[PDB]
C-alpha cells in the first residue's frame, strides 16, 4: 500500500497550516503564470492575425 495522491499531499503539506499557506502562496504564483500563458494563448488563437501581435511585421524594420 501507498497513500492515495491526496493522502500523500495531505501529510506533506496540509497537516500544518504553516505548510498549507506556504503551499497556497507557491500555488498562487505557479498557477497565475500557467493560467495566463494558457488562457492568453487560447484567446490569441481565436483571433489569429486580427491582433497587432500578429500584424507587427508589415511596417517593422523595412
Amino acid at each position: 500500500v501507498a497513500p492515495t495522491l491526496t493522502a500523500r499531499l495531505y501529510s506533506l503539506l496540509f497537516r500544518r497550516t504553516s505548510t498549507f499557506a506556504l503551499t497556497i502562496v507557491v500555488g498562487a504564483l505557479f498557477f497565475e503564470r500557467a493560467f495566463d500563458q494558457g488562457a492568453d494563448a487560447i484567446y490569441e488563437h481565436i483571433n489569429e492575425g486580427k491582433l497587432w501581435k500578429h500584424i507587427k511585421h508589415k511596417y517593422e524594420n523595412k
Binding site: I42, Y43, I46, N47, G49, K50, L51, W52, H54, I55
Partner: peptide, 16 residues
C-alpha cells in the same frame, strides 16, 4: 463581424 462572439477579438488590419 469577426468579433460578434464572446471570445472573438478585433481584427487590427481592419482597424488599420
Amino acid at each position: 463581424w469577426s468579433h460578434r462572439g464572446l471570445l472573438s477579438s478585433l481584427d487590427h488590419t481592419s482597424i488599420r
